[PDB]
């Protein structure tokens, strides 16, 4: 009725702070893993060159 | 009566690099057109 309640009440602030920091860390890790992937596609000049060769030019 | 001429000597065929009009179609095909010009010059130098 007296002791354990008081010590729990004393614990609350530090635990709240640490859990907030942990959530911020999770969000930071989520953001840090985001990279924009620039894809590379076959240049159409080679396609045009192959078209010309097929014409026997 | 000195030397007249070297019939063996032949003036090399002076090549000219083909020039394409500067339109958007040329920029898209810049690499392809350049290759054609290089092929044309190589053909002129060697003959065929």
TrEMBL record, chain A:
Gene Ontology cellular-component terms listed: kinetoplast; mitochondrion
Keywords noted in UniProt: Membrane, Transmembrane, Transmembrane helix
KW Membrane (keyword) present: yes
Domain of life of the source: Eukaryota
Name of the protein: Uncharacterized protein
Organism: Trypanosoma brucei brucei (strain 927/4 GUTat10.1)
TrEMBL record, chain B:
Subcellular location: Membrane
Taxonomic superkingdom: Eukaryota
Similarity comment text for this entry: Belongs to the ATPase delta chain family.
The protein's name in its UniProt record: Uncharacterized protein
Residues of the full protein shown: 208 to 255 of 255
């Amino acid at each position: 009725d007296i002791m354990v309640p008081s010590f729990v009440y004393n614990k609350l602030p530090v635990i709240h702070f640490l859990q907030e920091k942990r959530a911020e860390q999770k969000l930071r890790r989520v953001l840090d893993e985001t990279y924009t992937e620039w894809t590379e596609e076959l240049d159409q000049a080679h396609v045009t060159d192959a078209i010309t060769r097929s014409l026997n030019i | 009566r000195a030397d007249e001429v070297d019939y063996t000597n032949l003036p090399a065929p002076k090549p000219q690099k083909t020039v394409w009009d500067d339109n958007i179609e040329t920029e898209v095909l810049r690499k392809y057109l350049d290759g054609l010009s290089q092929y044309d010059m190589e053909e002129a130098k060697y003959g065929v």
